[PDB]
Amino acid sequence: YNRNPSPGDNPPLEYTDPVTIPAGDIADNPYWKRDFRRNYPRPSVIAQA
Amino acid sequence: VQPTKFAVTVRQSRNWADAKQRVIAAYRAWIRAAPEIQTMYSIPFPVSHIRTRIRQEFERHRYVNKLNVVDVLLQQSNADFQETMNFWRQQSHVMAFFKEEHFRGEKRLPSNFITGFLEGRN
Amino acid sequence: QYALTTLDIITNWARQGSFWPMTFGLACCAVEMMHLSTPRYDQDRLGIIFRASPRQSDVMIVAGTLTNKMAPALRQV
Amino acid sequence: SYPTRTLANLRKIGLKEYFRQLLYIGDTKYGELVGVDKFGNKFYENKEELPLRTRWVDYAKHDYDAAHIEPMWHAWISYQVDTPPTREPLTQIERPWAPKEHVPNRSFTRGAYKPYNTTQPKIQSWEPKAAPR
Amino acid sequence: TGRPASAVMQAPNRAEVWSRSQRPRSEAMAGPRFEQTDFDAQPRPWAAIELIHKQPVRWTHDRIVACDGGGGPHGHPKIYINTDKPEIATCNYCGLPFANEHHRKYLESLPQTSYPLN
Amino acid sequence: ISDIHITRTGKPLIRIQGGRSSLGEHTATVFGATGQLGRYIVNRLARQGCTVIVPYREEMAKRHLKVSGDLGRVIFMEFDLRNTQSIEESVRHSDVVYNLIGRDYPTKNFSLADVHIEGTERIVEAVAKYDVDRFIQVSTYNANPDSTCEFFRTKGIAEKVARHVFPETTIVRPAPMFGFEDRLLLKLASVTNLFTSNHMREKFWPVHVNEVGEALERMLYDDSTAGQTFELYGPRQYSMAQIAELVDREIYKKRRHINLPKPILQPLAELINRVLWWDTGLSRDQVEREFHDQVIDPTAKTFKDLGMEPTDISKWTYHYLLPYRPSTYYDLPPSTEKEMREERKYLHVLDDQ
Amino acid sequence: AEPQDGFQGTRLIPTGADFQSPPDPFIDEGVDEDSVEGRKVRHYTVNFGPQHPAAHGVLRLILELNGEEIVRADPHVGLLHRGTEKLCEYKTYMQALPYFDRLDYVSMMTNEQVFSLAVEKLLNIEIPPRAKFIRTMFGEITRILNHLMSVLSHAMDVGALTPFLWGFEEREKLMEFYERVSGARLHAAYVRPGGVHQDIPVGLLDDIYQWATQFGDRIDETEEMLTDNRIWINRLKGVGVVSAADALNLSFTGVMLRGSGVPWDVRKSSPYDAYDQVEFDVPVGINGDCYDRYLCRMEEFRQSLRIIHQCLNKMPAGPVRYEDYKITPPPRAAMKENMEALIHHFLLFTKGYAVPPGDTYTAIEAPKGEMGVYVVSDGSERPYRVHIRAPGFAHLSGFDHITRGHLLADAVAVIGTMDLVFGEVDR
Amino acid sequence: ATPAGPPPKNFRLPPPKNWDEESESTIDKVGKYFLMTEMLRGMYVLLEQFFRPPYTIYYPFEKGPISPRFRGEHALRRYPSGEERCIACKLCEAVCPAQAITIEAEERADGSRRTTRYDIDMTKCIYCGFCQESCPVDAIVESPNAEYATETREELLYNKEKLLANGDKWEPELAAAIRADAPYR
Amino acid sequence: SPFNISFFIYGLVFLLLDLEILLLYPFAVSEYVNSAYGLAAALIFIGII
Ligand SMILES: NC(=O)C1=CN([C@@H]2O[C@H](COP(=O)(O)OP(=O)(O)OC[C@H]3O[C@@H](n4cnc5c(N)ncnc54)[C@H](OP(=O)(O)O)[C@@H]3O)[C@@H](O)[C@H]2O)C=CC1
Ligand SMILES: *P(=O)(O)OCC(C)(C)[C@H](O)C(=O)NCCC(=O)NCCSC(=O)CCCCCCCCCCCCC
Ligand code: SF4
Ligand code: SF4
Numbered sequence A: 001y002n003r004n005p006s007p008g009d010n011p012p013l014e015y016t017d018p019v020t021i022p023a024g025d026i027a028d029n030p031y032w033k034r035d036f037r038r039n040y041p042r043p044s045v046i047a048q049a
Numbered sequence B: 001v002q003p004t005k006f007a008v009t010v011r012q013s014r015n016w017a018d019a020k021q022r023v024i025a026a027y028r029a030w031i032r033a034a035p036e037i038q039t040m041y042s043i044p045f046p047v048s049h050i051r052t053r054i055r056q057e058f059e060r061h062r063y064v065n066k067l068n069v070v071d072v073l074l075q076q077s078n079a080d081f082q083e084t085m086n087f088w089r090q091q092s093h094v095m096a097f098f099k100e101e102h103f104r105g106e107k108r109l110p111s112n113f114i115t116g117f118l119e120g121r122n
Numbered sequence C: 001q002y003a004l005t006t007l008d009i010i011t012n013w014a015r016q017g018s019f020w021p022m023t024f025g026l027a028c029c030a031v032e033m034m035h036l037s038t039p040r041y042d043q044d045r046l047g048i049i050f051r052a053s054p055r056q057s058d059v060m061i062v063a064g065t066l067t068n069k070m071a072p073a074l075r076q077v
Numbered sequence D: 001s002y003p004t005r006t007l008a009n010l011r012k013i014g015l016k017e018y019f020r021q022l023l024y025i026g027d028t029k030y031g032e033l034v035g036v037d038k039f040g041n042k043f044y045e046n047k048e049e050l051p052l053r054t055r056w057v058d059y060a061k062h063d064y065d066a067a068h069i070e071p072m073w074h075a076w077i078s079y080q081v082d083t084p085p086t087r088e089p090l091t092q093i094e095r096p097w098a099p100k101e102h103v104p105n106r107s108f109t110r111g112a113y114k115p116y117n118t119t120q121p122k123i124q125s126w127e128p129k130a131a132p133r
Numbered sequence E: 001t002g003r004p005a006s007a008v009m010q011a012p013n014r015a016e017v018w019s020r021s022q023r024p025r026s027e028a029m030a031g032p033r034f035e036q037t038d039f040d041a042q043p044r045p046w047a048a049i050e051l052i053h054k055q056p057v058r059w060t061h062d063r064i065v066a067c068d069g070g071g072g073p074h075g076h077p078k079i080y081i082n083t084d085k086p087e088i089a090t091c092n093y094c095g096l097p098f099a100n101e102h103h104r105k106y107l108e109s110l111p112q113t114s115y116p117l118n
Numbered sequence F: 001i002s003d004i005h006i007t008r009t010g011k012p013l014i015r016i017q018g019g020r021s022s023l024g025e026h027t028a029t030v031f032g033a034t035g036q037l038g039r040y041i042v043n044r045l046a047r048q049g050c051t052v053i054v055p056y057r058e059e060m061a062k063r064h065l066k067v068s069g070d071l072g073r074v075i076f077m078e079f080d081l082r083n084t085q086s087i088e089e090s091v092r093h094s095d096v097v098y099n100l101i102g103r104d105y106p107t108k109n110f111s112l113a114d115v116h117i118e119g120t121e122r123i124v125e126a127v128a129k130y131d132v133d134r135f136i137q138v139s140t141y142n143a144n145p146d147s148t149c150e151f152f153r154t155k156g157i158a159e160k161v162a163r164h165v166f167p168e169t170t171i172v173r174p175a176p177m178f179g180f181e182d183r184l185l186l187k188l189a190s191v192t193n194l195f196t197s198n199h200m201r202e203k204f205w206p207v208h209v210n211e212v213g214e215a216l217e218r219m220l221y222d223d224s225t226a227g228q229t230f231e232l233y234g235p236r237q238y239s240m241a242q243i244a245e246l247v248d249r250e251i252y253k254k255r256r257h258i259n260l261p262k263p264i265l266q267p268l269a270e271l272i273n274r275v276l277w278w279d280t281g282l283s284r285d286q287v288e289r290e291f292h293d294q295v296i297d298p299t300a301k302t303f304k305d306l307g308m309e310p311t312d313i314s315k316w317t318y319h320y321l322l323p324y325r326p327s328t329y330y331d332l333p334p335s336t337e338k339e340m341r342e343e344r345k346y347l348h349v350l351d352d353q
Numbered sequence G: 001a002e003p004q005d006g007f008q009g010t011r012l013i014p015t016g017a018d019f020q021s022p023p024d025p026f027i028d029e030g031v032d033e034d035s036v037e038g039r040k041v042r043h044y045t046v047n048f049g050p051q052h053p054a055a056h057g058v059l060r061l062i063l064e065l066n067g068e069e070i071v072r073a074d075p076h077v078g079l080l081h082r083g084t085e086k087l088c089e090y091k092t093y094m095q096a097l098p099y100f101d102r103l104d105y106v107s108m109m110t111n112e113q114v115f116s117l118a119v120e121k122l123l124n125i126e127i128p129p130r131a132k133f134i135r136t137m138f139g140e141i142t143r144i145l146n147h148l149m150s151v152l153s154h155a156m157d158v159g160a161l162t163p164f165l166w167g168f169e170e171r172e173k174l175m176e177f178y179e180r181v182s183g184a185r186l187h188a189a190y191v192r193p194g195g196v197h198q199d200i201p202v203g204l205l206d207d208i209y210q211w212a213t214q215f216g217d218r219i220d221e222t223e224e225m226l227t228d229n230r231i232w233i234n235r236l237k238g239v240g241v242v243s244a245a246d247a248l249n250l251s252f253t254g255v256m257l258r259g260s261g262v263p264w265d266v267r268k269s270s271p272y273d274a275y276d277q278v279e280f281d282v283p284v285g286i287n288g289d290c291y292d293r294y295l296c297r298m299e300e301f302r303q304s305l306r307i308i309h310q311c312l313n314k315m316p317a318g319p320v321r322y323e324d325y326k327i328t329p330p331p332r333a334a335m336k337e338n339m340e341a342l343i344h345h346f347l348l349f350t351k352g353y354a355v356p357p358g359d360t361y362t363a364i365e366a367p368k369g370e371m372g373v374y375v376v377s378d379g380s381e382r383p384y385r386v387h388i389r390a391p392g393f394a395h396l397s398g399f400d401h402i403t404r405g406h407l408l409a410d411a412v413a414v415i416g417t418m419d420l421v422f423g424e425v426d427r
Numbered sequence H: 001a002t003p004a005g006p007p008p009k010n011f012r013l014p015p016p017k018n019w020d021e022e023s024e025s026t027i028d029k030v031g032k033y034f035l036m037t038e039m040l041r042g043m044y045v046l047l048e049q050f051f052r053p054p055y056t057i058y059y060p061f062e063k064g065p066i067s068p069r070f071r072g073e074h075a076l077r078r079y080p081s082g083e084e085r086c087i088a089c090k091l092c093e094a095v096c097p098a099q100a101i102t103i104e105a106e107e108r109a110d111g112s113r114r115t116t117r118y119d120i121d122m123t124k125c126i127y128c129g130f131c132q133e134s135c136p137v138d139a140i141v142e143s144p145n146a147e148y149a150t151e152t153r154e155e156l157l158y159n160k161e162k163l164l165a166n167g168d169k170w171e172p173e174l175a176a177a178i179r180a181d182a183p184y185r
Numbered sequence I: 001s002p003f004n005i006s007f008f009i010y011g012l013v014f015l016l017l018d019l020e021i022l023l024l025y026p027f028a029v030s031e032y033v034n035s036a037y038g039l040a041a042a043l044i045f046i047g048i049i
């Protein structure tokens, strides 16, 4: 039962690398709606004035 | 000296009369300690060579006319004094302050133009 | 020649059978040297016993990053 | 080991083979022959032993060493594959550059690997040619 | 050095260097470190350049052919080779030869060719 | 000191003068590198970026020499003074070859003749076989081809064969050397039962191994030292008894001096050397060495010709004998009245622990 | 006008000793002669270390002793200071991640978790649910791994030697799971900004469940040897006692904070990853001593196991890596087939991803206390400043205040109750 | 030390119990002292281990388990043709966390983009595997070989002649580990 | 450095009790003759120490 089979005999072809529909689709996702790195918040600064 | 044997609370010189008083007390302790530094670290030099070399390290900063610069130079001394009087520095750190125990020796810059030219910048 | 060779083989047999290492576990590699003492890989079954003292030891295992502050104590040990 | 296990394996391998194993492995162990390395090492398997002890090797040399195992068998002995090199197609690739014999770890011997620079010196110097006078 | 053939010949398959900045083994394995040494134990891989040119040409009826290195995701990034010059076109990543069937007559007439061509 | 060296054969070296990772570009072969002197010549070349070929007989002994150099700098070769191939292939790449090989006693495998002659022969013949540029032969003080001492005889004859076949040989005749891990001060420091037959009356000019190690570097760096003989020795005349009292004055050790006459000591000296497998410090030829005094060659160059000053042994005894100084709280002097009073401000017992 | 006004010393900096205030006289709680009371006692100093166990590899603590008791304890650290915080300024963010494996070298995937969470916060990205659960599962496998080192090495110093060997088989089994997801028994480099490097292999969640079914029995037998043992009890009761007020004032975190009766866990108070999705309890002690901190650590064994089982049952499907190739590397198959993917592959492994400007202090509940990092970003591809907050560094700083008056055999127990790996302390 | 808002329900401890308020019979309490019963239980647990199977592996005859993703010594691989896979992009040189890779490339005699130098300082390398994640042609890998202690550290400066020799030696096992892990890469 | 007084107490309490138990060993090899009268005296000696 334990570590049986080894990972070396796990069939390569069985595993699937997934995509999620919004971000991995071909037809209804412009990248610029999902570019949250470039919509980063700025630091909001308030001085004594 | 509450936490350690030679600890001194970090203090800021109030004026030049105070700052010169501290420098002289720092120099006094160091040259007092030179026999104790020469046995622990087995320095193969006379106590006189140690004392004359301690003097050089104060003679470097004799022309400092800034009071904020003296306090950092005093704190550096006090900390160096603490790690030498407690056997914390290794003989290798201490007798590496003497700049003649390099296999090239004290003579490590070229003396003049021509001797450094014939040796390729020393 | 045989006789001196036998003296060597016996001497080498005991330098091999009792293999006592002094150790400087400086960092993580020491963890992996501790797993050499655990049940899966046991050193005792081959005769290895880590001794604290250098006087009782045969081999030094420098296992870990050596720093300038640690080096004088490495050479002393 | 334990008496029930060591007794049964004597009933299998015989007293001359029992002493062979005490000299090398230090255990009395019985299993099926799985194949032979090019270096001559022999591999055995027994699903009925303690975990991580189902596969072992009987080395061909007296001064054995873990670097005597040929590479594809090395994956089998390490439980990294379940198919031994005796049925693995990846070993049946023809590679004339591939080594013919198994070379082990060759340090501590006069055949130890010696590195060298593989590139030419950077700056070529003038080959002095004095013009005639 | 010098006496063994392995210390003298750049690779087992090839005797000469194959780039201008490659050090010959004769000069790389001279000096004191290579005394009291086994030169037949020294790492000496077969030269790839000789092996690649022993490769037969893939004849093709197409202008553009695709090479991925021959192992699916175990090859190189898939690229496209144009075979419209009367020469043998080679994959930039792996070196395999490709040639259009239109240049077979011309290619078979050359005296020396960079790939076996059959 | 210069960045360019044209070797005696004519090839140029372009050195970069720094430390371990630098380029000294000198290739050296030091024969006799595992003794007490060789570790100073090896370390001096290696720590400045030079390749040093170190032929060795025993694997364990040589190990301390590798620390001094960066990767590819200290190369070790397994050699035997009777295997010429090992000698040949140790010197084929070398620019300078050193020969420091020498015993003070005969063995079951080497007579002072075999070591100092049959080895110098076998080695210098290789130096001449490959046109090595500099060959430096370390001989002994008092070397003389016609001497009652086999050490002064056989080492004096090697000097002959060195220049018969290699006329451009530097000869170096050092005085008894002293310092760390020597057989001079450490002998007087360590032994307890000491045998002599000339009242410890040897007179000589003790020299520090460290200047000898530094001097051997400078014979490589000056092309003018090639082909002449040097006499390295210290600044003051000394007798062994005067040397011992210095050891005595530092360490406070009591030793037994037996001083058995020469007729009853020398025949006995051979026996002990023939049955004891370690260097017992007394042998037949070593006792004869006791009767001679060092005579300085007046036609031979000295430290000054190499820009060097020897140091005496008196300035160094405290340094090299300080490790051998048993000083506990017991041996301290009787206390004074002032400090006896200081003890009354402390409690010297913990009555609650 | 510093530094100009400081040249002549016209201003003095107001020190804390200026703002000292006398205690209120009313509600204030608690000489030379011929007698021996005025007499002074000499002390002698003692150089303690290095001990045999791996974790306390580079400790040179100098004690001053009055007889047997400790007067003042001065640890000298730095024997494993390797300049990590400087070398991190010359590396990209992905290149600097392996430096975090080597801080607390018994708790690797939680060191790289706090660096990933810090970088991910400046990236302004949300990592996928599967990597959230993978990280919370392997963060608790890590917590079990560290406690097996910390508890059993502590008892090996105290002189119990058998529980150490039993639980290092448990440690030996739990490092097989590290080597299956990554290829390292110690330094995985598995947790990375944007999720995890690779998906878990296809039979691992079954193998962790098989390990899970028996791990409680291992805690129970380890607990058979120490918990009720009077020798164990009489070597940890009353030892290394810190008050709740002082643990806060001393910068204590974790079980050092929690063993004095302060209920506080970063996982409960500032939830990260999938911790808000799992039910677990927080052991809080009473008497602030080593026995409480031993009992709190054993309870965490059972709580981490209870989280790992919950993570197995909520493991969702989907990417284990943030689905954006400007931040995380594309699959190998994409890079070998699609133009945009090879461009994003190439630039991530040479330049790295840019992090937007700003600074963040991020903390997690590491097994040795609170571990935090301060990262200044300059908007470029290399960190402008990385600062690691190590729980053990603050713990060793309070060793003098805690071991004062104790015996040296007591102080060895205090060293083990503080979870101390010196690569953590010196960064 | 407790959160703001109402204190936790029964956060405060009960008052301590006096010695005579404790619920433990003198017989039970005195017997456990003199008989040392809890120490007896722990000694019994060691008898239980005594009669259980050991965990030990006989190495080097039996090896421990290693995954297809294991990170051992480096190797340079070929194609089925025999050409080196490496085209000198230098990506593995850029990503090296410890600057352990030094690559010099130029145009080969046949015009192909190939390395002239390929050195890996095995004493600088941290065995992270980054070099093999960044490859676009699977040229650099880390074999499952962990058994190569050497005598001198000059033996740990792998040049391109040793790394290719390693790939020729280890190719079946390298191809096998790649075959297992490729879907996840 | 001052030495702790407890070292002295260990040797002293041993020295006296060890002398005391020594004085009882003759009783254990002379019990039958000593009988009740010897027991009473030894009980008195045991009681004092
Ligand atoms: N030191 C002194 O007081 C004086 C010494 N000298 C001479 O200077 C030289 C170096 O001095 P020092 O370092 O003290 O010498 P040591 O005796 O300490 O070392 C001599 C060296 O010669 C090697 N050697 C000796 N005999 C043989 C042999 N038969 N075959 C091969 N190798 C051999 C030794 O190797 P191994 O250890 O394996 O035997 C060792 O490396 C010697 O020639 C010495 O006689 C001259 C005058 C004074
Ligand atoms: P006189 O009135 O002529 O001079 C007095 C001074 C010097 C104060 C001048 O009047 C003055 O105002 N000078 C400027 C103030 C000044 O000197 N600043 C610096 C003072 S601190 C200092 O100089 C520290 C020096 C180094 C301390 C350590 C020295 C020994 C270390 C090595 C010892 C040997 C190895 C262990
Ligand atoms: S091994 Fe791969 S990453 Fe490294 S230079 Fe070659 S092709 Fe580029
Ligand atoms: S595994 Fe080693 S060689 Fe490869 S990138 Fe990492 S440090 Fe560099």
Ligand SMILES: [Zn+2]
Pocket (backbone or CB within 6 Å): E067, E068, E069, E070, E076, E091, E092, E093, E094, E095, E096
């Ligand atoms: Zn291709």
